[PDB]
């Protein structure tokens, strides 16, 4: 297990990163400082998480203290759905850069394939509760992403939550200048994603697995829901290897050649989650974990199921 994967822009991306969705702003600065101290070199961020300024304070302190050099960090952020318009993309990227205290991102993703009406609200609603869409299509948003590469604001661009047809749409774009480097998708033993991963990998697109622990802090959790960290079958694999259940759930995507971004704000767990480079799951263990698929999603963007570009009607 090598620590970085080569992307199609020629850059190397650390295969383990720290997630920041739901990390409270008064805890995420310490979380990111601890993560960099214990070896993380990849941080996954987004404007919609409302905590980039505090993530940026941590990054800046570790660069100032010379704990790490900027070239050794791999910082990812995402363009929110209300900024898909051509004339809004650069300013969205620059606001994220200003918050993170950076002069470039290593990777900038389209957060969802669905564009929404621009404005202050992240989920603009009609007087009945549906998301109000944008008419911009995702090929014109991709052209605006390509401009950020050519202006030096980002080293790589990619996509998130795109289905196979939508990835194909970008790959078949007339005049395509840069292929997506990454598709960041939900992936864990209850949503194993075989077909979409195979597709992306065959095209040289690296897949990042989000919610690898099943997001037990997601807002909309219902106790009736499946729980990866408590699944006795996964606890038994961890017990066999003398590791924690979370460590098995992080190692699993790594052995599928995925990048993985577990979130924690707890210092002991941040350190434990990084100690996954010293054991191997067998092929039998990997096949067993894959057999737990149930097509269960943490993140289904339920307010957007009539948007033309909603990604999850599609088999994959
Ligand atoms: N592209 C997208 O649309 C999208 C969507 C969802 C997620 N993401 C990205 O993926 C990251 C990871 O997904 P996620 O935040 O949904 O959930 P996750 O990483 O699956 O799970 C995070 C939860 O697990 C807990 N935890 C972490 N390590 C643990 C351990 N060793 N033992 C027990 N519990 C542990 C955390 O608690 P504490 O924090 O209290 O320690 C937190 O409640 C996000 O933070 C975000 O960066 C992207």
């Amino acid at each position: 297990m090598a620590s970085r994967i080569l992307l199609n822009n020629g850059a190397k991306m650390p295969i383990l990163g720290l997630g920041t969705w739901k990390s409270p702003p008064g805890q995420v600065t310490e979380a990111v400082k601890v993560a960099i101290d214990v070896g993380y070199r990849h941080i996954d961020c987004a404007h919609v998480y409302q905590n980039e300024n505090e993530v940026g304070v941590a990054i800046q302190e570790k660069l100032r203290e010379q704990v790490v050099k900027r070239e050794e960090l791999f910082i990812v952020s995402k363009l929110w759905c209300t900024y898909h318009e051509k004339g809004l993309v650069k300013g969205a990227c620059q606001k994220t850069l200003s918050d993170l205290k950076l002069d470039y991102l290593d990777l900038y993703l389209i957060h969802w394939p669905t564009g929404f009406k621009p404005g202050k609200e992240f989920f603009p609603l009609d007087e009945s509760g549906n998301v109000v869409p944008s008419d911009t299509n995702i090929l014109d948003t991709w052209a605006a992403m390509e401009e950020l590469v050519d202006e030096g604001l980002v080293k790589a661009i990619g996509i998130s939550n795109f289905n196979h047809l939508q990835v194909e749409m970008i790959l078949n774009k007339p005049g395509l200048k840069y292929k997506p480097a990454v598709n960041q998708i939900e992936c864990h033993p209850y949503l194993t994603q075989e077909k979409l991963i195979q597709y992306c990998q065959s095209k040289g697109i690296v897949v990042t697995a989000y919610s690898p622990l099943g997001s037990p802090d997601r807002p909309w959790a219902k106790p009736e829901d499946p729980s990866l960290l408590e699944d006795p079958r996964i606890k038994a694999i961890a017990a066999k290897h003398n590791k924690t259940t979370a460590q098995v759930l992080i190692r699993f995507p790594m052995q599928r050649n995925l990048v993985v971004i577990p979130k924690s704000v707890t210092p002991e767990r941040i350190a434990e989650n990084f100690k996954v480079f010293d054991f191997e799951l067998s092929s039998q263990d990997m096949t067993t974990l894959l057999s737990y698929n149930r097509n269960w999603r943490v993140c289904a963007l339920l307010s957007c199921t009539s948007h033309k570009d909603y990604p999850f009607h599609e088999e994959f």
Side-chain angles (χ1 to χ4, degrees), residues 79 84 89 107-110 136-146 148-149 156-160 162 169-171 173-182:
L79 179 76
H84 283 202
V89 168
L107 177 64
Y108 196 48
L109 304 178
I110 305 180
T136 298
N137 78 44
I138 202 67
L139 299 187
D140 290 324
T141 306
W142 186 254
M145 299 289 282
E146 293 177 323
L148 302 177
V149 179
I157 50 174
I159 59 188
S160 182
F162 281 44
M169 270 309 296
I170 297 293
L171 292 178
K173 176 182 182 302
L176 184 64
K177 193 173 184 181
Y178 303 114
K179 298 178 234 188
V182 167

Side-chain angles (χ1 to χ4, degrees), residues 21-22 44 160 184 211 213 215 217 263-264 266 272-273:
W21 179 37
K22 312 167 265 61
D44 183 76
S160 182
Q184 178 180 130
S211 302
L213 311 181
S215 201
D217 62 336
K263 173 269 181 181
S264 181
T266 302
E272 160 199 317
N273 289 352

Side-chain angles (χ1 to χ4, degrees), residues 18-23 44-45 49 78 109 111-112 160-161 184-185 209-218 229 244 246-247 250 261-266 268-270 272-273 298-299:
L18 180 72
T20 63
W21 179 37
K22 312 167 265 61
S23 296
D44 183 76
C45 310
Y49 301 165
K78 313 188 194 77
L109 304 178
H111 202 149
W112 289 87
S160 182
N161 301 299
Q184 178 180 130
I185 61 175
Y210 79 67
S211 302
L213 311 181
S215 201
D217 62 336
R218 63 198 180 284
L229 290 159
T244 70
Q247 289 167 328
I250 292 164
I261 51 172
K263 173 269 181 181
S264 181
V265 289
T266 302
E268 174 237 41
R269 289 171 171 176
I270 294 167
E272 160 199 317
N273 289 352
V298 169
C299 284

Side-chain angles (χ1 to χ4, degrees), residues 50 78 150 156 187-188 264 277 280 286 291 296 314:
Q50 299 187 225
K78 313 188 194 77
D150 289 327
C187 185
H188 48 68
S264 181
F277 294 88
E280 305 175 29
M286 294 291 294
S291 80
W296 177 78
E314 189 28 73

Side-chain angles (χ1 to χ4, degrees), residues 13-68 70-120 122-126 128-146 148-221 223-229 231-283:
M13 178 169 189
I15 69 176
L16 181 56
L18 180 72
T20 63
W21 179 37
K22 312 167 265 61
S23 296
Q27 297 175 252
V28 74
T29 298
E30 175 71 358
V32 171
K33 284 181 175 180
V34 167
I36 290 170
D37 288 345
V38 305
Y40 292 70
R41 295 293 179 259
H42 167 188
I43 313 294
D44 183 76
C45 310
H47 179 68
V48 79
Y49 301 165
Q50 299 187 225
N51 58 6
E52 293 194 311
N53 189 43
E54 293 85 357
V55 169
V57 170
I59 294 169
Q60 185 88 117
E61 275 284 69
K62 294 293 168 188
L63 288 172
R64 181 191 84 72
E65 288 174 357
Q66 293 203 148
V67 174
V68 294
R70 173 68 186 97
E71 41 261 71
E72 299 160 341
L73 291 177
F74 194 100
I75 310 301
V76 182
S77 188
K78 313 188 194 77
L79 179 76
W80 185 246
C81 302
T82 53
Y83 300 95
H84 283 202
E85 324 293 343
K86 133 248 137 217
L88 295 186
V89 168
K90 183 179 193 180
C93 186
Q94 184 53 57
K95 171 52 169 168
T96 280
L97 285 171
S98 177
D99 289 343
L100 290 169
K101 254 82 60 194
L102 297 179
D103 52 17
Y104 65 94
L105 295 172
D106 296 274
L107 177 64
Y108 196 48
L109 304 178
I110 305 180
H111 202 149
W112 289 87
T114 53
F116 301 167
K117 183 180 82 46
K120 289 179 155 39
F122 294 155
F123 278 88
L125 307 182
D126 54 32
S128 308
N130 305 110
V131 83
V132 180
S134 177
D135 61 8
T136 298
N137 78 44
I138 202 67
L139 299 187
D140 290 324
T141 306
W142 186 254
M145 299 289 282
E146 293 177 323
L148 302 177
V149 179
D150 289 327
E151 301 170 311
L153 287 67
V154 309
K155 299 293 205 217
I157 50 174
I159 59 188
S160 182
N161 301 299
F162 281 44
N163 73 33
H164 131 67
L165 297 192
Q166 293 171 325
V167 176
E168 188 175 49
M169 270 309 296
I170 297 293
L171 292 178
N172 287 344
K173 176 182 182 302
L176 184 64
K177 193 173 184 181
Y178 303 114
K179 298 178 234 188
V182 167
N183 188 16
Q184 178 180 130
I185 61 175
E186 188 180 332
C187 185
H188 48 68
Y190 298 157
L191 185 70
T192 51
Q193 299 272 28
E194 274 95 334
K195 180 52 327 244
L196 181 57
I197 289 170
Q198 178 48 202
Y199 177 77
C200 288
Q201 290 186 333
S202 82
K203 297 299 188 182
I205 300 171
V206 164
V207 172
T208 300
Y210 79 67
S211 302
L213 311 181
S215 201
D217 62 336
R218 63 198 180 284
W220 44 84
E224 342 131 57
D225 289 347
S227 165
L228 289 160
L229 290 159
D231 188 321
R233 299 172 296 181
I234 306 180
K235 298 162 35 182
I237 292 170
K240 182 165 78 164
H241 289 280
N242 304 125
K243 295 304 276 189
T244 70
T245 302
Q247 289 167 328
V248 167
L249 290 165
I250 292 164
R251 182 70 187 197
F252 173 52
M254 293 167 67
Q255 286 188 212
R256 306 175 68 191
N257 306 307
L258 311 177
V259 175
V260 62
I261 51 172
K263 173 269 181 181
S264 181
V265 289
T266 302
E268 174 237 41
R269 289 171 171 176
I270 294 167
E272 160 199 317
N273 289 352
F274 204 72
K275 286 196 53 15
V276 291
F277 294 88
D278 63 322
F279 77 111
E280 305 175 29
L281 297 168
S282 66
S283 178

